[PDB]
Design a protein around this ligand. Structure first.
Ligand SMILES: Nc1nc2c(ncn2[C@@H]2O[C@H](CO)[C@@H](OP(=O)(O)O)[C@H]2O)c(=O)[nH]1
Ligand SMILES: [Ca+2]
Length: 104
């Protein structure tokens, strides 16, 4: 069974924790990756009821199981805070335009 389901993509906790770690590392180092420069702040315009505090940061998680290193980030994201706390897993799948919805 999936720990997180983003549209048709299925993630375990281990996929999440690996993505997140990659992301937080760049963050800590003040480096970015991709044309969209990940990781970058997540404003929470959506108003998700996250249980950890802001600031929030978004980082792609890939259905391939690989760590994001550039190119298309797909639709799914991990959201972490300043404390390397998992805020949640979100996606553009099933959300209009460029909005997000949560993975279930
Ligand atoms: N929809 C949305 N986009 C945000 C938010 N904070 C920053 N953005 C950025 O604005 C861009 C337009 O959605 C996004 O790129 P991305 O979602 O394709 O990765 C996202 O990184 C937020 O709270 N909601
Ligand atoms: Ca996996």
């Amino acid at each position: 069974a999936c720990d997180y389901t983003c549209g048709s993509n299925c993630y375990s906790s281990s996929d999440v924790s690996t993505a997140q770690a990659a992301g937080y590392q760049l963050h800590e180092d003040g480096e970015t990756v991709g044309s969209n420069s990940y990781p970058h702040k997540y404003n929470n315009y959506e108003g998700f009821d996250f249980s950890v505090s802001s600031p929030y940061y978004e980082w792609p998680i890939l259905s391939s199981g690989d760590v994001y290193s550039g190119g298309s980030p797909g639709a799914d994201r991990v959201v972490f805070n300043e404390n390397n706390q998992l805020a949640g897993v979100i996606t553009h799948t099933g959300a209009s335009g460029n909005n997000f919805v949560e993975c279930t």
